[PDB]
Design an enzyme around this catalytic site. Structure first.
Site, PDB file in Angstrom:
ATOM      1  N   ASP A  59       0.795  -1.224   0.000  1.00 19.16           N
ATOM      2  CA  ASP A  59       0.000   0.000   0.000  1.00 19.16           C
ATOM      3  C   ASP A  59       0.831   1.281   0.000  1.00 19.16           C
ATOM      4  OD1 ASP A  59       0.998   0.130   2.557  1.00 19.16           O
ATOM      5  OD2 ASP A  59      -0.942   0.131   3.572  1.00 19.16           O
ATOM      6  N   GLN A  61       2.670   2.571   2.149  1.00 18.98           N
ATOM      7  CA  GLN A  61       2.822   3.167   3.471  1.00 18.98           C
ATOM      8  C   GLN A  61       3.749   2.290   4.301  1.00 18.98           C
ATOM      9  OE1 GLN A  61      -0.769   4.639   5.384  1.00 18.98           O
ATOM     10  NE2 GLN A  61      -1.949   4.314   3.502  1.00 18.98           N
ATOM     11  N   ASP A 138      24.905   9.683   9.399  1.00 21.18           N
ATOM     12  CA  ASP A 138      26.358   9.648   9.267  1.00 21.18           C
ATOM     13  C   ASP A 138      26.855   8.223   9.051  1.00 21.18           C
ATOM     14  OD1 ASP A 138      25.772   8.754  11.816  1.00 21.18           O
ATOM     15  OD2 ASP A 138      27.017  10.233  12.854  1.00 21.18           O
ATOM     16  N   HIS A 142      28.756   7.414   5.790  1.00 19.00           N
ATOM     17  CA  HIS A 142      30.052   6.797   6.050  1.00 19.00           C
ATOM     18  C   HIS A 142      30.266   5.591   5.144  1.00 19.00           C
ATOM     19  CE1 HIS A 142      33.324   5.160   8.761  1.00 19.00           C
ATOM     20  NE2 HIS A 142      32.915   4.063   8.150  1.00 19.00           N
ATOM     21  N   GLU A 143      29.281   4.697   5.089  1.00 18.42           N
ATOM     22  CA  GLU A 143      29.469   3.453   4.354  1.00 18.42           C
ATOM     23  C   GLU A 143      29.436   3.681   2.845  1.00 18.42           C
ATOM     24  OE1 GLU A 143      30.436   1.083   5.989  1.00 18.42           O
ATOM     25  OE2 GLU A 143      29.644   1.286   8.029  1.00 18.42           O
ATOM     26  N   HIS A 146      32.663   4.728   1.485  1.00 23.57           N
ATOM     27  CA  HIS A 146      33.610   3.659   1.179  1.00 23.57           C
ATOM     28  C   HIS A 146      33.538   3.280  -0.293  1.00 23.57           C
ATOM     29  CE1 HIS A 146      35.435   2.874   4.977  1.00 23.57           C
ATOM     30  NE2 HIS A 146      34.317   2.523   5.585  1.00 23.57           N
ATOM     31  N   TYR A 157      42.668  -1.262   2.922  1.00 23.01           N
ATOM     32  CA  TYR A 157      42.005  -1.327   4.226  1.00 23.01           C
ATOM     33  C   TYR A 157      42.924  -1.895   5.306  1.00 23.01           C
ATOM     34  CZ  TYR A 157      37.381  -0.115   2.373  1.00 23.01           C
ATOM     35  OH  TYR A 157      36.307   0.541   1.817  1.00 23.01           O
ATOM     36  N   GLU A 166      39.035   5.039   6.577  1.00 23.90           N
ATOM     37  CA  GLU A 166      38.011   5.199   7.605  1.00 23.90           C
ATOM     38  C   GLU A 166      37.740   6.669   7.894  1.00 23.90           C
ATOM     39  OE1 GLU A 166      35.828   3.654   9.703  1.00 23.90           O
ATOM     40  OE2 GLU A 166      35.964   2.088   8.169  1.00 23.90           O
ATOM     41  N   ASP A 185      26.620  17.289  14.076  1.00 23.46           N
ATOM     42  CA  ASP A 185      27.677  17.302  15.075  1.00 23.46           C
ATOM     43  C   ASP A 185      28.923  16.684  14.454  1.00 23.46           C
ATOM     44  OD1 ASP A 185      27.524  14.369  15.424  1.00 23.46           O
ATOM     45  OD2 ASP A 185      25.595  14.837  16.360  1.00 23.46           O
ATOM     46  N   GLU A 190      25.896   8.715  16.783  1.00 24.66           N
ATOM     47  CA  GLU A 190      25.188   9.024  18.020  1.00 24.66           C
ATOM     48  C   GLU A 190      23.700   8.712  17.926  1.00 24.66           C
ATOM     49  OE1 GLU A 190      26.619  11.113  16.000  1.00 24.66           O
ATOM     50  OE2 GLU A 190      24.930  12.259  15.197  1.00 24.66           O
ATOM     51  N   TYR A 193      23.445   4.739  18.533  1.00 16.81           N
ATOM     52  CA  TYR A 193      24.360   4.120  19.484  1.00 16.81           C
ATOM     53  C   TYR A 193      23.774   4.185  20.890  1.00 16.81           C
ATOM     54  CZ  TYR A 193      28.868   2.910  21.679  1.00 16.81           C
ATOM     55  OH  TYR A 193      29.876   2.313  22.397  1.00 16.81           O
ATOM     56  N   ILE A 197      21.894   5.355  26.800  1.00 15.45           N
ATOM     57  CA  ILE A 197      22.934   6.259  27.284  1.00 15.45           C
ATOM     58  C   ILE A 197      22.892   7.528  26.445  1.00 15.45           C
ATOM     59  CG2 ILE A 197      25.381   6.592  27.724  1.00 15.45           C
ATOM     60  CD1 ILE A 197      25.620   3.517  27.861  1.00 15.45           C
ATOM     61  N   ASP A 200      26.447  10.046  24.057  1.00 15.66           N
ATOM     62  CA  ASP A 200      27.658   9.362  23.630  1.00 15.66           C
ATOM     63  C   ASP A 200      27.598   9.057  22.138  1.00 15.66           C
ATOM     64  OD1 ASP A 200      25.683   7.468  23.715  1.00 15.66           O
ATOM     65  OD2 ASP A 200      26.933   5.906  24.625  1.00 15.66           O
ATOM     66  N   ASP A 226      42.364  -4.789  14.390  1.00 16.01           N
ATOM     67  CA  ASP A 226      41.587  -3.818  13.623  1.00 16.01           C
ATOM     68  C   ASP A 226      42.281  -3.479  12.304  1.00 16.01           C
ATOM     69  OD1 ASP A 226      39.493  -2.088  13.044  1.00 16.01           O
ATOM     70  OD2 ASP A 226      40.424  -0.398  14.097  1.00 16.01           O
ATOM     71  N   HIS A 231      40.162   1.763  12.424  1.00 15.00           N
ATOM     72  CA  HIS A 231      39.137   2.528  13.126  1.00 15.00           C
ATOM     73  C   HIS A 231      39.685   3.287  14.326  1.00 15.00           C
ATOM     74  CE1 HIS A 231      36.735  -0.663  11.084  1.00 15.00           C
ATOM     75  NE2 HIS A 231      35.908   0.345  10.873  1.00 15.00           N
TER      76      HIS A 231
HETATM   77 CA   LIG Z   1      23.582   6.599  23.138  1.00 15.08          CA
HETATM   78 CA   LIG Z   2      27.043  12.512  13.848  1.00 13.30          CA
HETATM   79 CA   LIG Z   3       2.608  -0.923   3.930  1.00 13.22          CA
HETATM   80 CA   LIG Z   4      23.839  14.282  14.984  1.00 18.78          CA
HETATM   81 ZN   LIG Z   5      34.143   2.403   7.643  1.00 14.27          ZN
END
Ligand SMILES: [Ca+2]
Ligand SMILES: [Ca+2]
Ligand SMILES: [Ca+2]
Ligand SMILES: [Ca+2]
Ligand SMILES: [Zn+2]
EC number: 3.4.24.27
Length: 316
Positions: A59, A61, A138, A142-143, A146, A157, A166, A185, A190, A193, A197, A200, A226, A231
């Protein structure tokens, strides 16, 4: 699929309503024909077989809980496309309007997202460390960045070239976040994540040390984890980019900021004209210096600020 372009409506991971470009053909598909050769979003159905099924909806939606990660992956891919087209005159990630494909609901409790060489892939998170990662613009940018890097500089990498890879993704992920201008920012991830919390993020470009990442070349990680700290040591380049844009004094070295737009122009030019698969940090500095010289002149404030910024993080 062949069909007619339509416009649906839904809600993203964070509960916000947005319109999305879809395609009608019996079902409504998350296929946006308004950008290059299409933005396509797929359902991986909690499994790891890619890409999954092209997202179909009866539909047009998209307000179901299960719809939300697809809405945001689809919509934020479009914003990122618009950024590269409008700001850098780049048509999709290969410069020739390659189709942008994304799969959501990848696996179960998967606390990551990635570009796999051919498409974007987003976990839903485990609800504790992450919520579905396409909710972060972001992260999406970000991805997809790449993909841009892999088609242009081709930075390997691992080790310093991988840390540059990165950092470039964090830089343009952040500039896309500023371009869309929704709570922008210099933090990474953020919005998706640790939902329990406040305040952060996964990484900080303004203060990488906030999360234990180096903010000076002398503090770089030299082990093998890594992929050699790709990273981790990205914090050194992220800090340099933050200083170029915003300015500051870092370990006693003062940088006059020149703004986000000029940061983007310098680093995009460096990425697409001068960087190579094996570029190290010092070679990035030279690429950025030459790019700023091309754009603004050898005696410009912009060139001077690039030099001060890389000085501040100890990259000669
Ligand atoms: Ca958080
Ligand atoms: Ca950000
Ligand atoms: Ca739907
Ligand atoms: Ca932000
Ligand atoms: Zn990456």
């Amino acid at each position: 699929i062949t069909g007619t372009s339509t416009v649906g409506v839904g809600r993203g991971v964070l509960g916000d309503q947005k319109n999305i470009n879809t395609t009608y053909s019996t079902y409504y598909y998350l296929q946006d024909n308004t950008r290059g050769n299409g933005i396509f979003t797929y359902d991986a159905k909690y499994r790891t077989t890619l890409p999954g099924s092209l997202w179909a909806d009866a539909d047009n939606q998209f307000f179901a809980s299960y719809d939300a990660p697809a809405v945001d992956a689809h919509y934020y891919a479009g914003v990122t496309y618009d950024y590269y087209k409008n700001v850098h005159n780049r048509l999709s990630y290969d410069g020739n309007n390659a189709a942008i494909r994304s799969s959501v609901h990848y696996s179960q409790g998967y606390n990551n997202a990635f570009w796999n060489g051919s498409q974007m892939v987003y976990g839903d998170g485990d609800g504790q460390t992450f919520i579905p990662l396409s909710g972060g613009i972001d992260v999406v940018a970000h991805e997809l960045t790449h993909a841009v890097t892999d088609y242009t500089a081709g930075l390997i990498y691992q080790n310093e070239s991988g840390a540059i890879n990165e950092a470039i993704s964090d830089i343009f992920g952040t500039l896309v976040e500023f371009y869309a201008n929704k709570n922008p920012d210099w933090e990474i991830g953020e919005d998706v994540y640790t939902p329990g919390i406040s305040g952060d993020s996964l990484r900080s470009m303004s203060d990488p040390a906030k999360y234990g990442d180096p903010d000076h070349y002398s503090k770089r990680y030299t082990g093998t984890q890594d992929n050699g700290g790709v990273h981790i040591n990205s914090g050194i380049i992220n800090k340099a980019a933050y200083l170029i844009s915003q300015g500051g004094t870092h370990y006693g070295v003062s940088v006059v900021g020149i703004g986000r737009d000029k940061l983007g122009k310098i680093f995009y030019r460096a990425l697409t004209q001068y960087l190579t698969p094996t570029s190290n940090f010092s070679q990035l500095r030279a690429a950025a210096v030459q790019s700023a010289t091309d754009l603004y002149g050898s005696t410009s404030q912009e060139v001077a600020s690039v030099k001060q910024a890389f000085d501040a993080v100890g990259v000669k």
